[PDB]
Every structure is written in C-alpha cells, then in structure tokens.
Amino acid sequence: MDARAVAKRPRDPADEDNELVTALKAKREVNTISVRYLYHADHQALTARFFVPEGLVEFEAQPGALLIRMETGCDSPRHLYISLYLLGIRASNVSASTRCLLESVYTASAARAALQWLDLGPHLLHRRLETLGCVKTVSLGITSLLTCVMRGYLYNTLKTEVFALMIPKDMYLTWEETRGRLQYVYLIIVYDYDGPETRPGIYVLTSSIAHWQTLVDVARGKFARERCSFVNRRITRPRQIPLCTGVIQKLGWCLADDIHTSFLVHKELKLSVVRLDNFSVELGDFREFV
Amino acid sequence: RVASGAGLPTSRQTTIMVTKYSEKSPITIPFELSAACLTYLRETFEGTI
Amino acid sequence: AMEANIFCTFDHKLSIADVGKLTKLVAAVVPIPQRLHLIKHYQLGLHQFVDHTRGYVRLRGLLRNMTLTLMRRVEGNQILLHVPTHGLLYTVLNTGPVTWEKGDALCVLPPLFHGPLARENLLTLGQWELVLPWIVPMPLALEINQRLLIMGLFSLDRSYEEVKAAVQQLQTITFRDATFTIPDPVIDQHLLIDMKTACLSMSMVANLASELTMTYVRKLALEDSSMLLVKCQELLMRLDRERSVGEPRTPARPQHVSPDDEIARLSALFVMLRQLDDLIREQVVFTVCDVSPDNKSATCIFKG
C-alpha cells in the first residue's frame, strides 16, 4: 500500500506478455507451438461443446440455431438435442406446406426418434425442454460436435463474421407496430387444449417489453383464445389438472434494426426465416402463466 | 521426591509432560476511495488553475 | 491483480488430518449469512440455522437470503471464499445426491439426509459441523418441494392406513438416478411449526378465496369484454360430477357481510400469499454447461 500504487491505472492483459510467454522468457525454451499470441483470448461469450448425432445436423450447418435438450424416460438415450426447426414439425403454428417441406428433411431414425419421444409422454412439452443457446462452428463429421453459446454474442473465431440468429418465419411474431430501438427475444410455447391431446403452438416473440407483468398482460391479448380453451377444458373434464397455457422464457435480445427476412439453403431447399443479426444470447427460464 | 522412613511406602518418581498451543486472531480495516477521487488521480484534463 | 475473496479463520485449532478434509471442499458452495470480509468459522456454513423445533422451511427461507460463496483456497491457517458474480462460470463440487447432466438448471436447497446412515460426517470440530446445502436440478427441487407440502397436509391424518401408506409412497422419490427417500416432517405425532404455518398459508388461500371471489366475479361477468368469467362462474362451483337435479345453479356467495370486515378478509387473503411466497417460486442459482467425468465437478454459469 503506497500512494502511487492506488494511483496506477488498471493494467490490461494485452500489455503484459502471455503467461506462457512469461514462462518461456524466463526459461528460454522454444517449442514448435506458436504461443506468441493466444487465440480466443478476447471472448465475453461463454460456450460449451455438445456432441450431436449426424441425424440432427440438417439445417444446423448454418451457424445460429437453438439447441434444446429433451429429456425422455429411457435411461440409455437420457436426452437428445433438438433444433428449433426439428421441433417445428410438432408445432401447430407452422404452415402445413412448411411442415411437410421440412419434415422430409428429417428422414433419419435419430430425428424420427424425436417425434416418437414427443408423442410418448402425457406430461406437457414445456417441461421436457431446456434451451442451450445457439449453434456455431459445426464440427460436421460422422457425428457433429456443435459449439453452443450460453451467453454473449455469436460470432466467428477471430470475430471475422457475426453469426445471426435464424428463426423460421412462421414462428416469428411481432406484437407492436412501432419497433423500439432495442428489443428482447422470448420463446413462447402455448398449449391450445383439445380432446385427444393438447397440441402445442410454438412462437418467438421479439418485443421491446422487458417487464414480466406488462409482457404477460400483452400476451394474453392474442392468446385469449387458448386461455379460454384452457378454462373450458378445466370445467369440461373433472379430475383433470391441466396446467399453464403459455410459457415464456427470455431468449436474449437484438437491436430491432437488424431484423429482416432471409432463407436457409440446404439440400436445395429454400426456407424463409427471419434473421436477427447481432443476436446476443442471455438465457432466462420458462415462466409458467395462465 | 523426599526419601521415606521405616514402614512407610516410598515414592515413585514421576516425569510429567505438557504442551501449549497457539491461537489465531486476525484483524481487518476497510478504507474507501470515491471514483471521483481516483479519476483526478490518474486522468488529467485540460490543465487549468 | 488479486481476485477478491473473503478470509475465514477457525477459532478452534485444526488438525493435519482435518485440513485435508477442506481440500476436498475447495471447489464447493459455502453459504454465508452476510457479505463481510473476515469471518469466524461459527458464522460459516448452514449449521448456525439448525434448530430443534424449526424445520425445513425455516432453512429454505433463510437460505434464500444468504450469500452464496465457493471455497477458493485453503491456507492452513486461513480460508478464502470467493463470492460468485452473475454471468461468469464457476466450478462447483457435486454435494447433491443426483448426477447432473449438461444444461441442467441447478438450485440450492437445505440438506435432506434421511434416516439410515450413508456418507455424511466430515468435519466435526468443537461440537460444530460444516453442513452444506444440497445442489439439485430444478425439477427435483420442484418435486421435493411438493412432497413435503403434501406430507404436511397429511400430518393431521396418521390414524388412517391409506394415508399411512400414501405417505410412505411420497417419502421415497424415484428419480432418474439412485433413489433418495425424503425424511418425514411429521415427528412425535405432531407437525413442526414451519410446515404448519405453510399449510395454513395454503389452506387459507384455498378456502378464503372460495367464499370471497363470488362477490366480485358476479359483478365482472356483466361486462363480457374478456368473455370467460361467465364460464368461470360455473368453475367456482367446485362440483366434480355433473350437477344433480337439485340446488346448484349459481355458486354460493356470502350474505349481508358487514361493510368493513370484507376488507379484512380480503387483506388476510393477501397476507397468506406472502407467507407462501418463499415456497411458491424456486429460483435457479447455477446453469451447468459441462460436467466432469464421474459427475463430480461441474462448471456452471452463475445465476442470481
């Protein structure tokens, strides 16, 4: 503790040589490896590697796509890492043309297992999922090892390019007519109740709204139909205890000027999707609501 | 040990061993500096009276 | 520059065999009552909140407010304890019973050791022990949290063999891993005070609302903008079978109620939700990204 010591400006790591260089300068040994500069040393993004079988790589080779775990029963396949697109076949929001279009693309036993494990359970869909973030750097082999962002920006190694979130156009929705300068992206599963099964309808709802109470208040606007159908099923069936009718989870944010249409291009199959461009991921959690 | 007399039991010698132990008790004082104070310490603007 | 920490010291002496037991927990959460800098071991850990009569909900309600903290580095005569920051990944040791897969949303809960002994005892020290909170996946917390509330509602009914058996079924959760039975809150034929107050918080909300909401729903259903409160007036009836050819055509509503007491019943409905709020909404405190082999360490991005 000296007066000068508090007076010193904070010292940024680039000003000091790399710790490996600090050892090699002291001991002077020279390996073949180029430790002169460390890659990935400036990354506020936090990441995790997920092994995903080759039957699920389609439409994920493009960087930027949700990873969602899916717990199913059987102890051998403890989980399975669904894309957002693969979940669209089950959704009721998706166009039948788009659904039959992309359903052909998932003609693999690994993906068809996902439809079977979706049908299998009585308990609601929103329970089985846990969003993991977004694809980047597809390992692209007999079994892709996808790198997935938990927080921060999606971008290339070396920050040479910014990966963009891609959301299939039928799921994308906007409540408001005058977009704000910044707006948050939320993923919204909404059960509409029906006799044989309560079919889910997925959406992704960008909005400048941040407050939870005001957000759910505006949400019950469009979802009054599903909410009233839940109330009607509540009285139609005794000793049936159906729970929440939409579920919202904060998915991240984008600047609302970045939003614009595009298409994914795979197996010569154009797919119209909205494209948040500099989409920083900041995961939230599913919030039950009526 | 004192030496004993006739018909009285004698005294066996007794080595004794013992041990002390140290005890810890640290101290701490906080002192704080406003950022407005630090920013004039290191940054310096247009040098004016 | 040095990482910010919280030094901790042991008033009672430490054995060479004792300090080796801390190197095992060097990467484990250690909850602290209050952010400070120097801390005696007495204020360390959850053991200060042990009680005889007070139960699981006391621990849960005080545990919500304690400052989570990892152990950082044993010094022999000292212990560092880093306070996690939101949005940076910290490794944690797997004190919880259940194995964590990657992507799980963990949360902290009081320890829930059951009767027959397993590995529990580590750091007896001067009639004092370092109890550590369970770290458990979110759904298992949602399930344990209800098992206790139902055994509390059954605490009044242990004469019946059917309840006597159903309690045993709630007692032993069956999870996707080795199973861990849950200790019964009831003891000595009599329920502990915390679960009793929480069950009152639930049953007041279950009963005070039924007699109260009709005076308001009858008036709101007139407007029709929402278009479901008329359907909700039938939902009020709480009938299970289809109505007989008898009394019910409208829900029962309170009569004549004296002008002011209606405010007191209304506000007492809202006072019970506040007692219930500690159990209503569990909150994530970690989100594990990758797990070590043997599911022993995990590296979770901190939340909160």
Which string of DSSP letters, residue by residue, matches A184-196?
Answer: EEEEEEEEE--SS
Residue of C nearest to B21 (CA): C13
CA A144, A148, A154: angle at the middle one, nearest 5? 120
Residues C91, C297: contact at Cβ < 8 Å? Answer: yes
CA C181, C186, C189: angle at the middle one, nearest 5? 135
Give the count of Cβ contacts less than 8 A between chain A and C.
53
**A26 Cα to chain B: minimum distance (Å):** 32
d(CA C40, CA C38): 7
d(CA C275, CA C270): 9
d(CA C201, CA C219): 27
Residues 10-49 of B with CB under 8 A from A: 33, 38, 41-42
d(CA A102, CA A111): 12
Residues C301, A151: contact at Cβ < 8 Å? Answer: yes
Q: Provide, as residue numbers in chain A, all residues whose Cβ is less than 8 Å from the Cβ of B41.
A: 6-7
* Chain C CB within 8 Å of residue B24 CB: yes
Cβ–Cβ below 8 Å for C240 and A150: no
DSSP state of C100: P
Pairing, β C105-109 against β C38-40: unpaired
Residue of B nearest to A1 (CA): B31
Residue of C nearest to B24 (CA): C11
* Token duo for residue A252: 């991240």
DSSP H or E segment with residue C107: strand C105-109
Q: Provide, as residue numbers in chain A, all residues whose Cβ is less than 8 Å from the Cβ of C226.
A: 224
Q: Considering all CA atoms of chain C, what is the largest pairwise distance in Å, rounded to the nearest integer?
A: 81
* Chain B CB within 8 Å of residue A41 CB: no
Cβ–Cβ below 8 Å for C289 and A224: no
Method: cryo-EM
Cβ–Cβ below 8 Å for A7 and B33: no
d(CA A90, CA A116): 11
CB proximity list for B33: less than 8 A, separation 6 or greater: A6
Closest by Cβ to C37, choosing from B21, B25, B28: B28
d(CA A148, CA A137): 8
d(CA A244, CA C279): 18
Q: Provide, as residue numbers in chain A, all residues whose Cβ is less than 8 Å from the Cβ of C232.
A: 231
d(CA A184, CA A218): 14
- Residue A131 has phi, psi (to 5 degrees) of -60, 140
d(CA A7, CA B39): 9
In a 13 Å sphere around the CA of A269, the CA atoms on its Cβ side amount to 14
Determine which of A4, A6, A8, A11 to mutate to test the interface with B (most B C-beta atoms within 10 Å): A6
Determine which of B23, B24, B28 to mutate to test the interface with C (most C C-beta atoms within 10 Å): B24
* Token duo for residue A207: 């909005």
d(CA C70, CA C79): 11
Q: Provide, as residue numbers in chain A, all residues whose Cβ is less than 8 Å from the Cβ of C177.
A: none
C275 to each of A213, C190, C200, C219, C280, how far by Cα in Å? 21, 21, 9, 29, 9
Burial of B41 (0-12, 13-18, 19+ CB in 10 A): middle
For the CA atoms of A200, A206, A210, A214, the dihedral, rounded to the nearest 10 degrees, stands at -60
Q: Provide, as residue numbers in chain C, all residues whose Cβ is less than 8 Å from the Cβ of B20.
A: none
Cβ–Cβ below 8 Å for C37 and B24: no
Q: Provide, as residue numbers in chain A, all residues whose Cβ is less than 8 Å from the Cβ of B38.
A: 6
Residues C71, C27: contact at Cβ < 8 Å? Answer: yes
Residue of C nearest to A44 (CA): C88
* Token duo for residue A167: 């959301």
- Which three-class secondary structure state does DSSP give residue C194? helix
Residues A169, A272: contact at Cβ < 8 Å? Answer: yes
* Token duo for residue C295: 């599911």
d(CA A259, CA A276): 5
According to DSSP, the residues that pair with C190 across neighbouring strands are C187
DSSP state of A225: H
Q: Which amino acid is at B17?
A: M
Cβ–Cβ below 8 Å for A150 and C289: yes
Q: Which amino acid is at C226?
A: S
d(CA C279, CA C147): 12
**B46 Cα to chain A: minimum distance (Å):** 19
Q: Which long-range contacts (CB under 8 A, 24 or more apart) does A233-242 make?
A: A233/A193, A233/A198, A234/C235, A235/C231, A235/C234, A235/C235, A238/C239, A238/C240, A238/C241, A239/C240, A242/A191, A242/A193, A242/A198
Q: Provide, as residue numbers in chain C, all residues whose Cβ is less than 8 Å from the Cβ of A283.
A: 287
d(CA C163, CA C136): 28
A31 to each of A16, A34, A45, C40, how far by Cα in Å? 20, 8, 30, 48
DSSP H or E segment with residue A51: strand A46-51
First to last CA, chain B: 88
Residues A286, A247: contact at Cβ < 8 Å? Answer: yes
Residues A206, A183: contact at Cβ < 8 Å? Answer: yes
Residues A127, A234: contact at Cβ < 8 Å? Answer: no
Residues C130, C45: contact at Cβ < 8 Å? Answer: yes
Residues 2-21 of A with CB under 8 A from B: 6-9
Residues A220, A205: contact at Cβ < 8 Å? Answer: no
d(CA B39, CA B43): 6
**A132 Cα to chain C: minimum distance (Å):** 6
Helix A224-236, helix A212-222: angle, nearest 10: 80
**B21 Cα to chain C: minimum distance (Å):** 9
Per-residue b/e over C110-127, b at no fewer than 16 CB within 10 Å?
A: bebeeeeeeeeeebebee
- Helix H, strand E, coil C: the string for C3-36 is CCCCEEECCCCCCHHHHHHHCCCCCCECCECCCC
